[PDB]
Amino acid sequence: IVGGTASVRGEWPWQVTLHTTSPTQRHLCGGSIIGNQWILTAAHCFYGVESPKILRVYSGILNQSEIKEDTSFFGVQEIIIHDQYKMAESGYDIALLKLETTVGYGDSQRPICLPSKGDRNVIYTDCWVTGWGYRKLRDKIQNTLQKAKIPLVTNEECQKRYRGHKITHKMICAGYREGGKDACKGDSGGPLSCKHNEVWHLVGITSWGEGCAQRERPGVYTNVVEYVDWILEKTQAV
Ligand SMILES: O=C(O)c1ccc(NC(=O)[C@@H]2[C@@H](c3ccccc3)CCN2C(=O)/C=C/c2cc(Cl)ccc2-n2cnnn2)cc1
Numbered sequence: 001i002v003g004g005t006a007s008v009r010g011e012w013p014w015q016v017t018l019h020t021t022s023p024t025q026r027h028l029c030g031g032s033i034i035g036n037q038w039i040l041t042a043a044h045c046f047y048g049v050e051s052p053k054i055l056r057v058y059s060g061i062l063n064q065s066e067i068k069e070d071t072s073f074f075g076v077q078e079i080i081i082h083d084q085y086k087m088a089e090s091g092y093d094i095a096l097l098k099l100e101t102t103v104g105y106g107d108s109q110r111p112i113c114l115p116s117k118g119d120r121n122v123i124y125t126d127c128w129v130t131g132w133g134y135r136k137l138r139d140k141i142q143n144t145l146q147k148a149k150i151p152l153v154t155n156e157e158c159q160k161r162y163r164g165h166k167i168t169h170k171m172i173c174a175g176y177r178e179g180g181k182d183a184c185k186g187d188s189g190g191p192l193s194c195k196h197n198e199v200w201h202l203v204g205i206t207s208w209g210e211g212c213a214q215r216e217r218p219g220v221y222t223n224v225v226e227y228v229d230w231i232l233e234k235t236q237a238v
Contacts, residue, residue, distance in 0.1 A: 001131050002213035003181035004148030009062045012130050014112035014202070015145065015190060017061055018045065018097070019073075021054040027141050030131045030190020031097065032202055033059060033111045037077075038235055039097040041189035042205050042222065043085040046095065052076035057099060060108030063143050064132055075100035080234050082227075088188075088208040091170045093222045095189075096234050112193060112202045115225040124152055124194035124203060127174060129219065133186030137212050141186045148181040150174040150192075152203075153218045161216050170226045172204045175218030182219045184212035192221045 016039055020028040031041035039057055049055070056073040078098040085092040103109060130147045134140065151174060158173035159165075167173065174192060175182055183190070183206045192204030204221025211217060 001129060001133055001142075001146035001148050001182070001187060002135055002184050004146035007062065007130065007145040007147045010107055011147070012145065012191070012193065013060070013108055013110045014193070014200075015130055017058045017064065017067075017132060018189065019056045019058065019067070020049070021056065025056075027064060027132055027186060028055075029188055030206060031057065032191045033103055033109060034114060034202065034231070035111060035235055036102045036105070037099045039099065040202065040205065040224075040231065041095050041097060042088070042093045042207055043081040043095040044088045044093055044207070045189045046079055046081060049079065052079050052097070055079075055097070057097065059103060060106075062145055064141065065143055074103065082230065089165060091168050091222070093207045094205060094227050094230070096231070112191065112200055114228050114231060115201045115203055117225065117228055119196070119201070120225055122196055124196060126196070127152055127192055127194040127203060129174065129183050129187065129190070129192050129206060131183060131187030131190040131206065133188075134184040134212065137184065139184070150181055150219070151176065158218055158220070161218060162210070162220075167220070170223050171207070172221045172223040173218040174204070174221065175213070177216060179213045179215040179217065182209065182213035
């Protein structure tokens with residue numbers, strides 16, 4: 001996260017850190033708990049991931065330093081990538097991780113509500129992007145989970161800023177015209193959480209942008225409301 005501050009413990013209890021084991025253990029992506037055996041993340045996170053066996057999901061983490069060989073994690077049973085997904089910039093950047101065991105909800109880890117299909121018309125004024133990503137384009141993964149409040153941008157405005165791209169209604173953009181606050185390397189897959197009527201909703205999934213926090217370059221997120229049916233299809237299969 002660029003231009004963000006340290007989170008307080010338990011502030012974003014749906015936020016997870018997805019680690020890869022191969023070649024060595026390190027943070028790969030962010031993700032969100034949406035169900036007791038479900039993580040919602042970005043499909044691009046799994047470029048070169050040939051098996052779920054190399055993945056470990058950590059919940060209830062504030063600092064990456066809490067993660068050692070003795071730290072409990074959830075194994076991944078299945079990686080479900082949207083079947084229209086080609087690349088982040090083309091859209092359909094969404095994936096589900098089905099966990100091998102059930103998440104026990106508590107004050108440190110609990111799910112985030114999906115947006116309501118009825119809330120396609122709401123104007124979110126309180127949105128936050130969180131992650132352990134870089135603070136600038138040439139940096140390193142951060143120890144403490146960072147947060148940054150970002151304003152949502154209309155599709156029309158975002159399209160003006162991404163000449164040469166097609167910004168679809170399945171994408172949602174966020175950022176300040178002057179830049180300064182945004183997601184960056186290592187934040188992808190994580191949530192864009194918006195508070196509406198005192199309830200937090202998973203409005204976006206950190207996906208892509210041209211650089212980090214640049215002037216007139218908003219961050220591009222998967223527009224979760226447009227994927228509620230796909231999420232229910234995959235999580236509620238008979
Ligand atoms: O340990 C590390 O050094 C370490 C180093 C980088 C990453 N991750 C990343 O760069 C991941 C990449 C990835 C992850 C997994 C598999 C394959 C591809 C794809 C891009 N990406 C982001 O995080 C996207 C960032 C991004 C998002 C928004 Cl909304 C705005 C601006 C952004 N940026 C523009 N230019 N940079 N950030 C993770 C870890």
